[PDB]
Amino acid sequence: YTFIDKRVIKRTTMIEGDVETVSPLKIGGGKDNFDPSSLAKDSILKDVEGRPIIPGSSWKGIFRSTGERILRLRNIEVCSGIGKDYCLNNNRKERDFNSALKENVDQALEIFWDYTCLNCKVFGTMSVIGAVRFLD
Amino acid sequence: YTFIDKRVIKRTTMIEGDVETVSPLKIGGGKDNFDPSSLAKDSILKDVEGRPIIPGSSWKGIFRSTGERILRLRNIEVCSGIGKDYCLNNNRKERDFNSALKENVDQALEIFWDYTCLNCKVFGTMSVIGAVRFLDSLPISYSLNTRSMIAISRTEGAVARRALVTVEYVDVGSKFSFKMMGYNLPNYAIGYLITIMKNIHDGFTQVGGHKSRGFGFVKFGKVKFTDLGEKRIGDEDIQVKDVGDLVEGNGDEFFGRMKPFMEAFNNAKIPYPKK
Amino acid sequence: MDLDVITTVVKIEGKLRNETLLRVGKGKTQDFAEATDNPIIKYRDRPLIPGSSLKGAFRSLVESYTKSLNDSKYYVCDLDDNSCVSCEEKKKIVEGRYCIPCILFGFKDLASRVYILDAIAEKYSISQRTMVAINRVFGGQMPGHLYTLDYVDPGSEFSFMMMIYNLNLIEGEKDWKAKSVEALKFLLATLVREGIFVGARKSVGYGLIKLVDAKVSLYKAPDHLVSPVIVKKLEEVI
Amino acid sequence: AIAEKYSISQRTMVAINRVFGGQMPGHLYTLDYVDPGSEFSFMMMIYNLNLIEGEKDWKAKSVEALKFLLATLVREGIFVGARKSVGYGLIKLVDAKVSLYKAPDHLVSPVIVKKLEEVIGT
Amino acid sequence: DLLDIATRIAISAIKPKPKSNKPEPYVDSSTINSLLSFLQSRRNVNELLLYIMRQAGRDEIDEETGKLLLASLKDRELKDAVNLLGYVKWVYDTLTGLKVNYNNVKGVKTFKELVNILSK
Amino acid sequence: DLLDIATRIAISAIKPKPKSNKPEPYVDSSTINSLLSFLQSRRNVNELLLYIMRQAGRDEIDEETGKLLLASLKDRELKDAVNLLGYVKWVYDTLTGLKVNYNNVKGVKTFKELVNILSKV
Amino acid sequence: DLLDIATRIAISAIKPKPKSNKPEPYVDSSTINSLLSFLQSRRNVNELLLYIMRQAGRDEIDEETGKLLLASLKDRELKDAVNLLGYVKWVYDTLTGLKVNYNNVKGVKTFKELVNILS
């Protein structure tokens, strides 16, 4: 039950890798302004020094969608982790979880372990922080 | 003892330095109060001059959370500090301290010493003041930049755009003046604070709003450590090698300089709480 | 001790510049000018530091200084102790144990010789900061402990005025009841350079006053009490 | 003295700290203050002392002491009332009329009505 | 008097919000507290009016309510402005806490009439 | 006279407060002291009415007691309002100190009746 | 002070766009936000002037509004520039939300005149 409990960090895993673009890459820069010395009107997201960084949000979204596809392939039920559609809401256990938050923590942990999916318990869901952090 | 006794100040420690943001930091604040200084859209707890100061309250909360994590890792009985107290109300001996507040001041001192966690003594829980004090951070080379996450993506379906959202953060490379002070802090407490600071510096702990998306990561490039007063406070303190009084330098060599303090704190049998 | 013969009148008047945002409490009373359940105290839309709070902070700092002196001749006694006296000199000789905080800020058996006025603000600005807690389990959730506090702007002048009687500072006392002038000078130096911490939070850095400059005017009774004898800047005094 | 324009305010203060640094509920008190900007009707009478013309012998010293007290009241001010350490209570005479009467001739109307400012400092 | 203006503007601001799931005031107390905080922080009337206009343009403020506020604060001193804002906030808080119906306070123009209505 | 009004107001304000786990009146002595202090400091009757209305809206002052206070404190002089508030405070303090049950005291509408009730037992 | 300049700039900018099938402003709030963000990030007044000139040349800012911006930001410090840009953004938001008509507001010189109009 250490997976959900964030009080104690009993392990720490870190992956540092290099991403090489086999195909051309275009991360949308907002298509609303071209502040730096870009090339086309639809500028990609870049640092003030011109460095075209990749947002951590994009990594998180890509990983979440790929995991959704993988779990759907493995016939494993999974939340959508977006909008008003997470299996906390789908299972109608949100009110009980909110009550348990003020109440004994063990009940909240049991609820979040039994009535919860994997993607929105790993990447995180509403009012719960995910276990994994994505950097830029 | 001297650690909880604030009548006499036998040791003063000052950790002052600059903090550099290696990540798009966003502290937030004022989400329900959109009355800024006419700068971007989302308030990020900035002064009226337009400078995004990092709140001391956030610094504390971060320090207390990291210390709680560390102590629970080291098998130390530490509770939360929000709606309860370390032991006290959590313990059976709650009203005993209140009774001893009036008379037998030494008895009350003893109750606190044997019935509290380390974070209780270093941060204060109820009717008490912690041995340490944080301050706000003043941006020096701050730069503001917005970003929009309006993207709802495929949504695992057909719709590719349903909602919209944008955020305003502090761009990387900004510099903030960081200062914190401590009173009657023993050697092990100072080493534990340095351990918390090193955990923050390495990146294991993050400060900000979008921590899951990798928004808060800060590092120290120049931090001064000035110690004034006695070298050891309590009998539980470990006699550390005399590193002097003025400790400074780059962040890496700074933390390499505070190795005796962290080593002493790790090699310290913590008496309280007795339980 | 001696208080009926007013020999030296020392007046310090300066500006207290608030370094970090300051919050002073009040009796939870309500007024139209505020919308917070726990606002800061002010007189007619003018935030001010009550003289009582400054007196308490100064007394606490002086007591800490005296106890750090670690000398038997100078002691600090409990506020609620009825057996304490300001001075307990005995002729065993003329050696006697005095209480510097009791001498300066008074006691139940001796009035204070250091009159401290309030300090109203001129270029003030009230700022509201909202802080919420983070539940340790399921980090990030706000458990509803959302409390918003009022503050003063980081930097605003305050009218500071303090009166000291029977304690020459510019010239000083030779050896009679000394170490009180030294304690007062140490307190003033701490206030000017470092600045003391006052306020409601005082642990997250909320509240750090500082005295930028103050003319020290000395009024002596025999020659001319109304006309100042010597006027000097506080920096030269310390 | 009565303030024709008075403004009474209350300011409760717990004001208790110890080694721990909290507030003990036992030590808690509230006080009521008249706000600054209240003018009190003040009248004082002196017999057989020429504050204007001056006096001689011991009467001269008495008049000098009275002049000193009046000058201190007008310029510096006098603390009176509650705790004087905290700046509670400091009166200052704004403007005064000094009417001198000499018996048995000039008692219906004063010979000279001069501002106290011009009397204390000459 | 200032209180009459405050009552009138609070009445104009307590109008029901059109197209809402539940009967709620068209203006929220958070907006009023934000007005007070903005005036206290900025300490000027011009940008206070600018903020009021921006809020009114971004919904959450009735057009007539914004017009009345602008007319009231068109030429006022800082102390008078903060006094009026405090009175408005207190009156709005009273109306919200009492759950007074809008239709029964559509004709009040003074403060005494509102007091009589509340008492009865 | 004014004493009867004050007694009725105090009786209305001493009714037990529902949804409170401890037996206590609907209002608290702190509220009465705040009322008196606010009236003294502001020296205005309309501001006092605003304070009363806001306190009633804060769900801490009984609506009947608030209506009684507003009815009494209109077209009334400042001195009369001060006297009425002082009488209300004194009657409330007496009832609190004597721990008078609201059940056997809600049926009196005259100060003399309250005096007789207290004297008899 | 700065409010009058901001109101003049916003009024000049809000004039209707020619050959437009819809009654739309000649410049949209996106441009104002882009200007403010550019000033906040680049933090160079000369770069801000160059960006304003480029936007004017891109037929996004009419020449009169560009001239007003250049005159009002010719030799200003960074803090004054960001304050003026924020004032301009807020005034543009007010005008857009109120759906004011340029034909009855063109003759505005001071902020007080705008206040009087919005009454």
Contacts of A8 in chain B (CB under 8 A): 69, 72-73
Chains that touch C (3 or more CB pairs under 8 A): A, B, D, E, F
Which of D14, D18, D20, D28 best probes binding to B when mutated, by most B CB atoms within 10 angstroms? D20
Q: What is the DSSP letter of D115?
A: E
Are C131 and C151 in contact, with CB atoms under 8 Å apart?
no
D10–F37 CB contact, under 8 Å: yes
Nearby residues of D80 by Cβ (< 8 Å), 6 or more positions away: D89, D90, D91
- How many CB contacts within 8 angstroms connect chain B with chain G? 30
Nearest CB to D85; choose among C26, C41, C55: C55
> From G33, which residue of chain B is nearest by alpha-carbon distance?
B40
Are B224 and B232 in contact, with CB atoms under 8 Å apart?
no
Alpha helices in B157-221 (DSSP H): 187-202
**Distance (Å) from the C-alpha of residue C150 to the closest C-alpha of chain E?**
9
Chain C CB within 8 Å of residue A122 CB: no
Backbone angles phi, psi at E22, to 5 degrees: -130, 150
The token duo for C95 is: 């050696």
Contacts of B217 in chain A (CB under 8 A): 135
- For residue B122, the number of C-alpha atoms closer than 13 Å in the C-beta half-sphere is 26
The residues facing B21 across adjacent strands are B218
Query: Smallest Cα–Cα separation from C188: which of C8, C4, C14?
Result: C14
- Distance from CA of residue B132 to its chain's centroid? 10
∠ CA B118-C208-B18, nearest 5°, is 70
> From E36, which residue of chain B is nearest by alpha-carbon distance?
B35
Count the residues in chain A.
Answer: 136
- How many CB contacts within 8 angstroms connect chain A with chain C? 27
For residues F105 and E44, give the distance between their C-alpha atoms in angstroms, rounded to a whole number.
Answer: 54
Can you tell me which residue has the tokens 């809020």? E55
Residues D14, D17, D20, D26, Cα dihedral to 10°: -50
Contacts of E42 in chain B (CB under 8 A): 48
**Distance (Å) from the C-alpha of residue B33 to the closest C-alpha of chain E?**
6
D20–B101 CB contact, under 8 Å: yes
> From E37, which residue of chain B is nearest by alpha-carbon distance?
B35
E41–C31 CB contact, under 8 Å: no
- Distance from CA of residue B176 to its chain's centroid? 15
Nearest CB to E40; choose among C31, C32, C126: C126
Q: Which of residues 45-84 of D touch C (CB under 8 A)?
A: 68, 71-72, 75-76, 79, 83-84
In three-state secondary structure terms, E40 is helix
Task: Tell me whether chains C and E touch (3+ CB pairs under 8 A).
Answer: yes
G93–E47 CB contact, under 8 Å: no
For residues F72 and F68, give the distance between their C-alpha atoms in angstroms, rounded to a whole number.
Answer: 6
Q: How far is CA B75 from CA A10, B68, B270, in A?
A: 11, 10, 11
B40–G36 CB contact, under 8 Å: yes
E86–C128 CB contact, under 8 Å: no
Contacts of B35 in chain E (CB under 8 A): 34, 37-38, 41, 51
For residues C219 and C223, give the distance between their C-alpha atoms in angstroms, rounded to a whole number.
Answer: 9
Nearest CB to C33; choose among E41, E43, E86: E86
> From B135, which residue of chain C is nearest by alpha-carbon distance?
C205
Q: H or E element: which one contains A73? A: helix A56-73
Helix and strand numbers (H, E) in chain E are: 6, 0
For residues B149 and B166, give the distance between their C-alpha atoms in angstroms, rounded to a whole number.
Answer: 5
Chains that touch E (3 or more CB pairs under 8 A): B, C, F, G
Pairing of strands A128-129, A124-125: antiparallel
Pairing of strands B175-183, B138-139: antiparallel
E37–B35 CB contact, under 8 Å: yes
Which of D4, D10, D30 best probes binding to F when mutated, by most F CB atoms within 10 angstroms? D10
The token duo for C21 is: 């945002």
Are F52 and F84 in contact, with CB atoms under 8 Å apart?
no
Count the residues in chain D.
Answer: 122
**Distance (Å) from the C-alpha of residue B30 to the closest C-alpha of chain D?**
30
Resolution in A: 3.5
| DSSP result, C214-238 | EEEEEEETTTBSSS-SEEEEHHHH-
> From F52, which residue of chain C is nearest by alpha-carbon distance?
C30
For residues B223 and B175, give the distance between their C-alpha atoms in angstroms, rounded to a whole number.
Answer: 12
Are C10 and D2 in contact, with CB atoms under 8 Å apart?
no
Task: Tell me whether chains A and B touch (3+ CB pairs under 8 A).
Answer: yes
Residues on chain D bordering chain F, Cβ-to-Cβ distance under 8 angstroms: 7-10, 32
> From G50, which residue of chain A is nearest by alpha-carbon distance?
A35
Q: H or E element: which one contains B15? A: strand B11-21
How close are the terminal C-alpha atoms of chain B, in Å? Answer: 18
Query: Smallest Cα–Cα separation from A35: which of G44, D82, D65, B186?
Result: G44
Are F70 and F49 in contact, with CB atoms under 8 Å apart?
yes
Q: H or E element: which one contains B183? A: strand B175-183
For residues C62 and C64, give the distance between their C-alpha atoms in angstroms, rounded to a whole number.
Answer: 5
> From B180, which residue of chain C is nearest by alpha-carbon distance?
C205
**Distance (Å) from the C-alpha of residue C138 to the closest C-alpha of chain D?**
31
Are A35 and G38 in contact, with CB atoms under 8 Å apart?
yes
Task: Tell me whether chains B and C touch (3+ CB pairs under 8 A).
Answer: yes
Contacts of B146 in chain G (CB under 8 A): 37, 40
Chain E CB within 8 Å of residue B212 CB: no
For C114-135, letters b (16+ CB in 10 Å) and e give bbbbbbbbeebbbbbbbbebbb
Task: Tell me whether chains G and C touch (3+ CB pairs under 8 A).
Answer: no
**Dihedral-angle region of residue E68 (phi above 0 means left; psi in -120 to 50 means alpha; beta otherwise):** alpha
| DSSP result, chain C | ---SS--EEEEEEEEEEEEE-------S---TT--SSS---BSSS-BEE-HHHHHHHHHHHHHHHHHHH--TTB----TT-SS--SB----------B-HHHHHH--SSS--SEEE--EEBSS--EEEEEE----SSSTT---S--EEEEEE-S---BEEEEEEES--SSS--SSTT-SHHHHHHHHHHIIIII----SS--SSS--EEEEEEEEEEEEETTTBSSS-SEEEEHHHH-
Burial of B187 (0-12, 13-18, 19+ CB in 10 A): buried
Q: H or E element: which one contains B96? A: helix B95-102
| DSSP result, chain F | -HHHHHHHHHHHHTSBPTT-SS--BSS-HHHHHHHHHHHHHH--HHHHHHHHHHHHHTT-S-HHHHHHHHHHSSS--HHHHHHHHHHHHHHHHHHHHHT--STTTTT--SHHHHHHHHHH-
Chain B CB within 8 Å of residue A80 CB: yes
**Dihedral-angle region of residue B132 (phi above 0 means left; psi in -120 to 50 means alpha; beta otherwise):** beta
Are B20 and B173 in contact, with CB atoms under 8 Å apart?
yes
